[PDB]
Write a protein that binds this ligand. Structure first.
Ligand code: NI
Ligand code: NI
Lengths: 209, 209
C-alpha cells in the first residue's frame, strides 16, 4: 500500500522536477499506469492517498490534478515542520545527542561538503530531520510526520541550494554534540526558515502556480 | 463521509463511556449498523477511518476491535496536543487574545462553574482548544488536529474532573486576556499535564487495558 503510493509519488515528483508535469496539471491515470506497470485501481487508490496529504486535488467525476503548490503551501509545510521538529529536539535533546545515528549522518554530511552528491544529501537530510521526530518515541507524532512525509519531500526538492543546507545541518549537529540545546534549536529554526525563503524564490521556475 | 464516521464514532464513545463496550473488544459491524440505521459498507468504511486515528484496530480477515487504550495511548495523545496547541498559542497569541470567540467561551466557562452541565463543558472545552489551532491560519496544522480530533475527544472523556478543568480553562483565558503570554503558555502545559495525570488514574475504571 505505502508501496504503490511511494512509486506513484516518486514518479510524480520525478516529472514535476523534470518539468514534464506542471503544478495544477490534470493527471492521466492510464499514463501513470503505463509508466509504472501498475493497474488502474491501485494507482487510483494511491492518488486518493496523496490527495490526503494535499499533493493531489481530487475533482469527483472529473479527475485528479497535481496540486498548484504555491507560497502558502510551502510556508504551511515548513511551519508545520518547525512546530514538530523543534518540539522533538527540545524535549528529546539528550536522546538525539547520544545516538550513534547522528554520527553516521555527520559522516554523510562531510561527504556532501566535499562531493555535493545530491543523493547522499537527500539521504542525510531525511535521516537527520526524521531522527528528531523518531527520538520522541511518540508513535502518534511519528505517524503524523510520516503521513505528510511525501509533502515534506516534494517541498524539500523545490529548492536548489542543498549544499548550503548541508552546511546548516553540519552546524546543527555541531551545536547538538556540544550540548548547546538552545543554540541547536535556534539553528534548526534558522535552517528551515532559510530553506523556506529560498524555496519561495525558486518557485516561479516551476510551470504554473 | 465525516458524517458517517462521526455517527459511528459517537456510538462507539457512548458505549465505551457506558461500559457497554470494553477496551480491546471486538466490534460487530451488524450491531453497529442496526443501532445506527446505516448499511454495512459505510460503517466498515467509517471504522477503517477510525483505525487511521488509532481508535480501532483492524485485523484483516478477522475483524475490527476497539483499541486497548492504555497509558501510552493517553500520554501520546496529550503530548501531541501540547506540541500543537502550545505552538499555536505562542505564535498566534495576539490573534487569539483579540478574538470575540474567546469572550463567548469565557461566558460558557462561567456557566459551568455555576451549573456543572457537562455538555456546556464539552462545547466550551472543544472551542477553546480548537481556537488556538484555528488561529494559526495554517490549514495543514488545522487538518492534522482535525484528523485526530476523535482520538482527542475520546481521551477528553476518560476523566471525570471536568469542573476542575473548567477552572483551569478560566485561568488560561484570564492570563491570555491580560497579555501574559508566558503565563498563558505555562498554564496550558499545566492544564494538559494535569488532565493527563488524572486520566491515567481513572483508566482502571474502564473494563480491560
Ligand atoms: Ni534540512
Ligand atoms: Ni482543556
Amino acid at each position: 500500500v505505502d508501496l504503490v503510493r511511494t512509486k506513484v509519488y516518486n514518479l510524480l515528483k520525478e516529472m514535476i522536477l523534470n518539468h514534464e508535469l506542471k503544478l495544477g496539471e490534470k493527471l492521466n491515470v492510464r499514463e501513470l499506469s503505463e509508466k509504472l506497470g501498475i493497474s488502474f485501481t491501485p494507482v487510483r487508490d494511491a492518488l486518493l492517498q496523496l490527495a490526503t496529504e494535499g499533493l493531489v486535488k481530487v475533482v469527483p467525476r472529473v479527475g485528479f490534478f497535481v496540486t498548484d503548490v504555491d507560497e502558502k503551501f510551502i510556508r504551511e509545510t515548513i511551519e508545520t515542520r518547525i512546530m514538530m521538529e523543534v518540539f522533538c529536539l527540545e524535549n528529546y535533546f539528550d536522546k538525539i545527542a547520544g545516538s550513534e545515528e547522528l554520527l553516521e549522518i555527520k559522516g554523510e554530511i562531510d561527504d556532501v561538503a566535499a562531493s555535493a552528491a545530491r543523493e547522499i544529501f537527500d539521504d542525510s537530510d531525511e535521516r537527520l530531520h526524521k531522527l528528531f521526530i523518531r527520538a520522541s518515541g511518540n508513535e502518534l507524532i511519528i505517524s503524523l510526520y510520516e503521513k505528510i512525509w511525501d509533502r515534506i519531500d516534494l517541498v524539500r526538492h523545490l529548492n536548489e541550494r542543498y549544499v548550503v543546507s548541508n552546511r546548516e545541518h553540519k552546524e546543527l549537529i555541531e551545536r547538538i554534540i556540544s550540548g548547546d540545546k538552545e543554540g541547536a534549536i535556534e539553528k534548526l529554526k534558522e535552517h528551515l526558515k532559510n530553506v523556506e525563503a529560498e524555496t519561495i524564490k525558486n518557485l516561479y521556475t516551476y510551470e504554473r502556480s
